[PDB]
């Protein structure tokens, strides 16, 4: 026979307290962002890296309201999945072309110095832009709002076929790890390391890259990981990888607002 | 909305898991895990499968 | 073994109230929802609400929102239809009957299995 | 949800295979369940999900799934099949039954 076990995993009240934390520095984040890719807007207008880098950030600066206001809620979607679809693809894509955009600047600042020139960099840009959208696509097209039929309560998560959801979770893991920390990281940090032969600022680009970005992948990580069920399953675990994701989530955010104060106002 | 589980195993035989845990969470109500003998890990039932949700409703009604 | 035994049931005027009861005993009531079920005297079934006993989630029909509440009591094993302002229309049959909530990625196991004997309610001047 | 159930009532003949049909107003993903009730009785469960039958019930009675078009069938009418069949859904929150289709004795 099979022995059967029984398990329940009963509310636990710190979530009111940690999402009414983090809505907090999320605002923090919101205005010091705007502030400051603002001002590195107007001064590129009046170098279109910095240009492209403002924009992206700005771009997914701008989202922040909407992910506080869902948050308040207990990431409850009370709009409609129009704008859920749409707010999930201007961050996404926004998201990406940033991260694209220092790999880009990194090499082309190394490259001048090692060595229509205009012309091919803008078709790169444009070239990174596509690539982003086209990244950003596949896990906006799956995506709806959802309400369950015992909460009663209305979430947005992505709905893949049911004869393959593994597939899709997986895949969509590994594509952005494998291209947005991977391989992204290791072409900065290659080049960087090429031109220091100041040479602080150069170690503190990098670091800054791989502190923003490096705790929330593990983090993500950690989570499939246990989606597998490679690690068992427990009430205080679930507890933590919460508190883990949506605090590492908080700590990659201030990338668009480190951005700019690093590459355009030390100088 | 994140619950234990996130897609099944329809395709399970009776011979081969020796262990089942009902979990019940307020995100994805009631839900199934098993452990497999042969591969030693843990897998997520699909109710659909007519042995398991006899097995389970007799357990629980005990 | 299973009983969904209800009581409380009798002449009633109208705009009272009334308290019905469900003394569940042979399950897990922890596990189960449980839902109320009238049927008028000679009509089809209706449906009128259900509630998780742990975690108390609970939905009204749109013909009793208001006016209905219900509520469950774990270490009694019991849950409690209160109802207020009743109506003539009122009068029915009520069945409580229990329901594990599998889940299904799409929905969840709504099946009533099992049911109790009803309890009229009368509800004249 | 307004899960129409037809035809009102049929007269059936021990033997005869009898067919009850019910049609959901908007989709339900296989959310569908049958009950039996007899005269002065509590209803009974036959079929969940959409086709699935529930344990202790007998092999005669079908179920399927075309879109939104549900059906259940006797295929061997006995003379204890006699009764309402009702249809119910439990995609929504907000579960709802059939208006009944009471099976009569021919003569």
């Known amino acids: 026979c099979i022995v059967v076990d029984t398990v329940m995993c009963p509310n636990m009240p710190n979530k009111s307290v940690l999402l009414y934390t983090l809505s907090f520095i999320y605002i923090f984040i919101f205005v010091i962002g705007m502030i400051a890719n603002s001002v590195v807007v107007w001064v590129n207008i009046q170098h279109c890296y910095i240009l492209n880098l403002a924009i992206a950030d700005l771009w997914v600066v701008l989202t922040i309201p909407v992910w506080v206001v869902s948050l308040v809620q207990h990431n409850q979607w009370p709009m409609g999945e129009l704008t859920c679809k749409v707010t999930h693809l201007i961050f996404s894509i926004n998201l990406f072309g940033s991260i694209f955009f220092l790999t880009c600047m990194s090499v082309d600042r190394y490259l001048s110095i090692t060595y229509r020139k205009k012309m091919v960099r803008r078709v790169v840009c444009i070239l990174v832009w596509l690539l982003a959208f086209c990244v950003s696509l596949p896990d906006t097209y799956y995506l709806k709002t959802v309400t369950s039929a015992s909460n009663n309560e209305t979430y947005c998560r992505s709905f893949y076929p049911e004869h393959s959801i593994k597939e899709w979770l997986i895949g969509m893991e590994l594509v952005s790890v494998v291209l947005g920390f991977a391989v992204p990281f290791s072409i900065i940090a290659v080049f960087y390391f090429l031109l220091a032969r100041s040479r602080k600022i150069i170690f503190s680009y990098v670091v800054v890259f791989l502190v923003c970005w490096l705790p929330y992948h593990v983090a993500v990580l950690l989570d499939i990981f246990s989606i597998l069920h490679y690690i068992p399953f427990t009430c205080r675990l679930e507890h933590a990888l919460f508190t883990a994701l949506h605090v590492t989530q908080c700590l990659s955010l201030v990338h668009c607002c480190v951005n700019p104060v690093l590459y355009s106002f030390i100088n | 909305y994140r619950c234990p589980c996130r897609f099944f195993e329809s395709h399970v035989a009776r011979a081969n898991v020796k262990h089942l845990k009902i979990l019940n969470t307020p995100n994805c109500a009631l839900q199934i895990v098993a452990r497999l003998k042969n591969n030693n890990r843990q897998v997520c039932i699909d109710p659909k499968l007519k042995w398991i949700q006899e097995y389970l409703e007799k357990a629980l009604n005990k | 073994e299973v009983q969904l035994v209800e009581s409380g049931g009798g002449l009633v005027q109208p705009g009272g109230s009334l308290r019905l009861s469900c003394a569940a005993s042979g399950f897990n009531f922890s596990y189960s929802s449980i839902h109320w079920v009238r049927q008028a005297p000679g009509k089809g079934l209706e449906w009128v609400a259900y509630?998780?006993?742990?975690?108390?989630?609970?939905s009204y029909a749109d013909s009793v929102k208001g006016r209905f509440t219900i509520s469950a009591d774990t270490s009694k094993n019991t849950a409690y239809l209160q109802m207020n302002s009743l109506r003539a229309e009122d009068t029915a049959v009520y069945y409580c009957?229990?329901?594990?909530?599998?889940?299904?990625?799409?929905?969840?196991?709504?099946?009533?299995?099992?049911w109790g004997q009803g309890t009229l309610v009368t509800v004249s001047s | 949800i307004q899960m129409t159930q037809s035809p009102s009532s049929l007269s059936a003949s021990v033997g005869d295979r009898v067919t009850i049909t019910c049609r959901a107003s908007?989709?339900?993903?296989?959310?569908v369940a049958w009950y039996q009730q007899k005269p002065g009785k509590a209803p009974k469960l036959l079929i969940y999900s959409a086709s699935s039958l529930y344990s202790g019930v007998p092999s005669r009675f079908s179920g399927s799934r075309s879109g939104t078009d549900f059906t259940l069938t006797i295929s061997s009418l006995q003379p204890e099949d006699f009764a309402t069949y009702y249809c119910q859904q439990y995609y929504y929150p907000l579960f709802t039954f059939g208006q009944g289709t009471k099976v009569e004795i021919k003569r």
């Open positions: 009957a229990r329901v594990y909530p599998w889940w299904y990625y799409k929905y969840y196991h709504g099946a009533l299995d099992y």
């Open positions: 908007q989709s339900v993903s296989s959310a």
């Open positions: 509630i998780y006993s742990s975690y108390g989630y609970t």
